[PDB]
Design a protein around this ligand. Structure first.
Ligand code: CL
Ligand code: CL
Ligand code: CL
Ligand code: CL
Ligand code: CL
Ligand code: CL
Ligand code: CL
Lengths: 316, 332
């Protein structure tokens, strides 16, 4: 009985720019493993990475998958792994891009795609290393209700900082207050972004974890404390020019970073911290689940437009 | 026999709207009162015009004297701390003469070497030279071997940056505003230099000057140029934001900003700084280093001297255009 792998290829975002292809996978050769997707991730970074993706190719992505059949002793049948296999239901691998797992049974495996995964790590190094928080600071976080934002705010809180979050809906604002943000506002409905930031924090901000860029970032600059630090993580919002006056006179430090910069022991340690914090209830998690591999492009679309509260996860 | 002194001062007649013009200034002449005990009468010898004045002027009240530092001689004194004849650096603004009770008088230039023009105290061995020293050595944080790019390379700051970089064993590329400036930069030691105002492609000029890209960008210009430089930075590259001359005349209508994608993927570090950050012994050490370097010939200098106090506004306008080669200095 042969297995049929369904994959989402980039046709030309909108549904029409995605095309599902089906292929019968060949038998396993020695050293290979047959994997079945359990939970697939859709992330903001994909919209950009789609660039060098020649049409017809399977979309890039990470997923949590189970080993169904195996001829690889490192990955026995029944094993659960993290793979960079892209948007596909089944795939064959010689073990190249796979990471081990089964991890407390009480934690859903899909957390390895979010809070105890890439987004969680982005939040961790972004806040603890780029911003360099040590406690007592006032931290601003944009797209605060997203996968990265939600973690940044909760880590800031456990480190004893005052935390302000900017999100895209009133539903999200209630959520942020629920996970511990000291202040939270809908940046889309502000009368004055400048005054909202002032209201949120009269004395300004020590660190700004940026996921939006553009106008938001520019306005934030004027409210940074001297020697303030801005960690450029993403830019969901051509952006208007920043004021040189603020950067120079307040002597601000702006640094862009990619989570992949940190590897080895430091990365392993950060994942243990993230898992520990989740087990201690210090970092609550929420996954916006879309059921059905057939609904992945839609899930991807829904996420990009901000209809997602927390980590976007698609179940096979 | 008391003869009165008349002080001439350049006042900001109207706040700058876009590029400053002669009509924005108004010369005033005033009869100075006699000195009271504890006061001193100073006569400007050399006056400075600097990029920061374009922005600092926004805080002035119309009719006020333009701000600025100058080297002045104490003509008469009733203040024991400033004897008649002494030379001082003072923040008295654009004025030929002024009375001070000690306020504004930053320091005596008593130990100054005669072979060095006093105006170097306003440039290479002054604020611009300090800005370059700390911007390069502390912000860019060079250790040697890096490839440094500096905009407005032939200006007061840029000229010093490139020279200190060279003594530190760095490769230096200068983006200057004229062909004469290119020749000058090469003569003082820059490894490469191009005219960013005439080169067909800024991208190709940067690539040609350094195929492997840049470790630090000492930014004096900002704007479109800065945005273009980001694509040429090496991963983890550092950009020291010193000034933004290309946008000082359009702070209310700024051009598009830098690519978030370049900053993120190249993982760049941008830091603004002002020379005020370094005070005390650290600043004194820098000044001593700057003077030693100038006396030894390791740091060459050129002053862009405009003769006559009545030409100060034009000197300021020219410098703002980035057209001065070396420190813009006005002789009274
Ligand atoms: Cl199985
Ligand atoms: Cl959000
Ligand atoms: Cl997400
Ligand atoms: Cl003005
Ligand atoms: Cl006014
Ligand atoms: Cl120049
Ligand atoms: Cl100058």
């Amino acid at each position: 009985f042969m297995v049929k792998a369904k994959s989402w290829t980039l046709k030309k975002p909108t549904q029409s720019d995605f095309e599902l292809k089906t292929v019968e996978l060949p038998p396993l050769k020695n050293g290979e493993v047959l994997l079945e997707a359990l939970f697939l991730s859709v992330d903001p970074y994909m919209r950009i990475a789609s660039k060098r993706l020649k049409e017809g190719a399977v979309m890039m992505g990470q997923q949590v998958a189970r080993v169904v059949e195996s001829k690889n002793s490192a990955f026995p049948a029944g094993s659960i792994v993290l793979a960079q296999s892209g948007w596909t239901t089944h795939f064959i691998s010689d073990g190249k891009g796979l990471e081990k797992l089964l991890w407390p049974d009480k934690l859903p495996l899909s957390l390895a795609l979010g809070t105890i995964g890439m987004p969680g790590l982005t939040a961790y190094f972004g806040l603890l290393e780029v911003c360099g928080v040590k406690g007592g600071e006032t931290v601003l976080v944009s797209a605060a209700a997203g996968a990265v934002g939600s973690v940044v705010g909760q880590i800031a809180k456990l480190k004893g900082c005052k935390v302000v979050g900017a999100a895209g809906s009133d539903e999200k604002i209630a959520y942020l207050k629920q996970i511990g943000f000291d202040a939270a506002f809908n940046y889309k409905t502000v009368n004055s972004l400048e005054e909202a930031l002032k209201k949120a924090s009269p004395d300004g901000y020590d660190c700004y974890f940026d996921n939006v860029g553009g106008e938001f970032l520019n306005t934030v600059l004027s409210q940074m404390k001297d020697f303030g630090k801005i960690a450029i993580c993403g830019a969901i919002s051509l952006p208007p020019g920043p004021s040189p006056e603020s950067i120079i006179y307040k002597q601000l430090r702006i640094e862009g970073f990619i989570v992949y910069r940190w590897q080895g022991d430091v990365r392993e340690k950060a994942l243990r911290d993230l898992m520990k914090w989740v087990l201690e209830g210090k970092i609550q998690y929420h996954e916006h689940v879309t059921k059905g591999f057939e609904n992945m492009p839609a899930a991807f679309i829904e996420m990009l437009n901000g209809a997602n509260l927390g980590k976007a996860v698609v179940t096979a």
